[PDB]
């Protein structure tokens, strides 16, 4: 009996089968509902569109995400997303397979509690297990000594791990992920003229970001270069047929990850929460935590990030310490790959939360078994 | 000791206020300027600091022909610029502190000026 | 010619006048810089708020403490806090009064050295003396034979004293005070849902701690009681207007003092460094050092600790010695009270470090005069 | 050398003299050109009428606004409007007076760049300055801590301000204003019969909106009240001589403001943008932003808007927080009044953009001086 590994992220939902090397079906986790007036009597107009279907029919919809900053705000439609991904996407019977769920560190307890309650009392799965994300990232990277930097569309957190021994007093969660990057971008386009207000236009801005924005190496120098118009400009063709040309704000958007004063936040950029998390650990651990900085999650897929990050760290760490960032080319699905690896381990398969244990204990059992 | 320090600080403020207002009144009465009675309310609009400061120095100081709050704050900014030009080093002294009438601070800069000249 | 006694703690600075019975003016020792963009031409805006002013005009500010863990890590603005105390809070001429400063045991020498240098070459005091924080406590309590345990926002001493004869091989220092308790509370508040991140919100968390947190008499019992909901919960009301309801993280925050593993530390709790500091002393002394445990410092004001500490010690010390914990009601200002006493002793005027001695000796005279 | 304060909004152009308490000249910013055939050989028929002149002779003109939604669309005639203001209404050679222009937040940079280029290279003004509107509104209201709801005929934008420190990460700009309300009104009239199509007919519809339309308090109740025909009907007399009678649509035109779904927009009414702009600011600031919501601009001169706004905000603010709406009587001109105050200060004079500086840097100097 195989198991289900659905990395129910806060942006796309990457789900699949325990054991494989790649998720079956991924898709944005947006539940859309029509807003315009419908006048055609003989239609099979569905109530609410969810997934890439909704992502296809935007100009009628109010796209809303159920998950914001990791936590789940609307529990009604998240049920719809799970229903969709179990029937229409994988076409499996949930009553047969154990399910693996992922989460971020420092999340409300009610989150995982109600998640378990919905997974059992509604889908009647045989067993369920929710595992922290940045541990599965190490799993997939095949290490046992790293300081993961998970970040995308939601939260951004480090979890230092020495030898299968996490250091829970040195994880550094931060709410500065791709969604805030997207909003800052669609706020900063207005300087050139193009305004994107609706949610159907927020998707267009996210898409611009995903394929036009890189990370500078030296931000001030790149800014001074872009002043004398040069090869920075790039043209993008909206679904309307018009073209826009963003020259300067191709690195000013993802520079937020390093100067979160651009959005009014006080925290220090990802180049420094990492260093603070390392310094929170023990002396004997820092020397080989500096060496394995696993990066995971989408937002770490900008072009020049595995280099500005490295420079910004070696500018902080002692002069005689070897820094290496481990950024695999599939650093977007690494969480799910680790999930598939873990759920297919001969040792682990006795750690699930079987339905018997839930019925004998209650939803407060995830805090006990996880 | 059920936190009795409140009354001690308030009486300290009173005994400082009496001496300070007597000094500023004796300074106002030399140049033919009307005396004041309230240390903490007759210094809001920041005008009385300006002529007092010019009598302390001996030069001219204009005033903005206004009466709203931003005019008071502009007057106090003038006062602080003048004070800084005489190397009077204040730290937690801002424009809004005077115009809000902050006892702990409104007799902090007076003591600064006193200690600078007298 | 009266003298000044400013217990420049690591949290709130408490200054005053020698001979008196209460500090004239106390205030948190935080220097804030405004971070947002200032657009109003006619304002007389300062550029550095400090003290209760910075504490109030808080939403615009990046609050920062100059003193951390007892030591001074920013001399640029610690000078500002001293300037504030001398000229605005007390309004006195430094060139007229001698100043008495306090410090913690086992502190870097450079700390007191630079403290003296700044107090002479900048404020031109005629005389200055720096005393250890856990002896003025005995002065204030009137004893001469005790084992002081002061703590709050940076340190936790144990200076056992038999008869004006401190035993410097039995002083235990431990950096487990108010600020670490505050950060731990702020970190466990997440699991309920509330998330305080910035410094302007760290202040609110500290204030939640001060007036909601108590120390359990039996932790493993209080925890199991708070499981079945009862009178444990409370309700703080932020300046936002929203209310929060912490029920469990009320004795789990200050339980850190007795189990420092809760924040990831090896060192044993304060209920055991006291016992170790006693056992390092002589046999003919422990038999009455047990009977005088002068608690001092801020963070020893929880509605608990004065009894759970005694309960935890009488389970270590032999069943014959009679244990007693002297917890006076003002066990907070006790250090400054002792300062106002010691500065007004007739037999003390031959202790100050006169300016002549500083000029003829340099700043390294503190080690030989203290 | 008194300066000029000409706030050229989207609709009316209110100009005057820096220092005084009232704009000298007020007139709509339309530029009319004839269309009908002209058959009279002696007439001195000018080329393009502009201003209230072009308003009175609007029977044979094609009225047209250069400014749409704050930004400027046609420059050849905005030049004409400035020329008109300087030479016919005020009659003052600009080569002597400085000039204080006003813009809106989040406007294309090229807008203010070309604006200053025109001001210096066609009028040779000695110095100019472009200041955001929702700051001048606070100036005029004499506050320093408010959240300015400015809205007339082109935009609707909040700018939260605590103490001279604006928060540019929290200004919300909804693009729905008087012109959209007018278009909706003229589109909703035609369900009773009256058809207004030409631009002159649009001016007539605006002259209706300005003096027959109020804001409901409980819109859903006002519907069913005006259902059973009652005192709601009014009778307005077109310039032709005939009369109309709009009963219901006099409170459905400005209810668009609170539900912009009536005109197909997706955004949230002016109450939720105010609440969101408050919630983006810091906890310490929300308390006294909730109390000073300075309304501004024309569109906020509807009769029952100060109370609908307050009810709607109290409905979503915390229960124990005090809400007060600062709606001055002459708020229409509040922006210009604040401009007159600001230019007449004494400290301001070092903020002008001297012509020498423009010759040095060029038009980009505005982005760094403003
Ligand atoms: N090529 C890319 N470059 C930059 N950012 C990207 C790229 N691809 C995806 N992202 C960002 O990653 C986010 C989704 O990443 P992911 O890690 O899957 O989020 P989640 O963990 O919530 O599933 C998107 O919001 C997008 O902003
Ligand atoms: N009643 C209280 N309950 C719990 N903690 C307190 C209480 N009063 C003060 N504290 C803590 O004590 C700290 C201040 O203690 P104090 O001894 O004045 O510091 P310092 O040693 O720097 O003077 C504060 O940071 C606060 O965390
Ligand atoms: N007395 C009024 N009652 C209601 N609405 C009005 C009134 N006067 C003007 N308006 C609306 O205000 C708009 C003009 O606002 P105004 O403040 O002139 O905008 P701007 O900032 O562009 O100058 C007009 O479009 C009109 O719809
Ligand atoms: Mg991820
Ligand atoms: Mg203390
Ligand atoms: Mg306006």
Give your account of this protein's structure.
Chain B: May play a role in anchoring the cytoskeleton to the plasma membrane. Chain B: It is found in: Postsynaptic cell membrane; Cytoplasm, Cytoskeleton. This is part of a larger assembly, with 3 copies of chain A (370 residues) and 1 copy of chain B (118 residues). Helix content of chain A is 34%, strand content 15%. By secondary structure, chain A is an alpha+beta fold. In chain A, the strands form 6 sheets. Chain A has a 6-stranded mixed β-sheet with strand order 3-2-1-8-9-16, with helices on both faces. A two-stranded antiparallel sheet of chain A has the order 4-5. A two-stranded antiparallel sheet of chain A has the order 6-7. Chain B has one domain: Orthogonal Bundle (Actin-binding Protein, T-fimbrin, domain 1). Chain B is 59% helix and 0% strand. In chain B, helix 2 packs parallel to helix 3. At the C-D interface, strand 5 and helix 6 of C face helix 4, strand 13 and helix 10 of D. Strand 5 of chain C pairs antiparallel with strand 13 of chain D, so a sheet runs across the interface. The structure holds adenosine-5'-diphosphate (ADP) (3 copies) and magnesium ion (3 copies).
In short, what is this structure?
Helices cover 34% and strands 15% of the residues of chain A. By secondary structure, chain A is of the alpha+beta class.
Helix and strand arrangement:
The structure is cut from a larger assembly and holds three copies of chain A (370 residues) and one copy of chain B (118 residues).
Chain A: E1 4-8, E2 12-15, E3 25-28, E4 31-32, E5 49-50, H1 52-56, E6 67-68, E7 71-72, H2 75-90, E8 99-103, H3 109-121, E9 127-132, H4 133-141, E10 146-151, E11 156-161, H5 178-188, H6 199-212, H7 219-227, E12 235-237, E13 243-245, H8 270-280, H9 283-289, E14 293-294, H10 305-314, E15 325-326, H11 334-343, E16 353-354, H12 355-361, H13 366-369
Parallel strand pairs in A: 1-8, 8-9, 14-15
Antiparallel strand pairs in A: 1-2, 2-3, 4-5, 6-7, 9-16, 10-11, 12-13
Helix pairs in contact in A: 4-11, 5-6, 8-10
Chain B: H1 5-28, H2 47-57, H3 69-85, H4 95-99, H5 103-106, H6 109-117
Helix pairs in contact in B: 2-3
Bound molecules: adenosine-5'-diphosphate (3 copies) and magnesium ion (3 copies).
One adenosine-5'-diphosphate is lined by residues 9-12, 152-153, 178, 182, 206, 209-210, 297-299, 301-302, 332 of chain C.
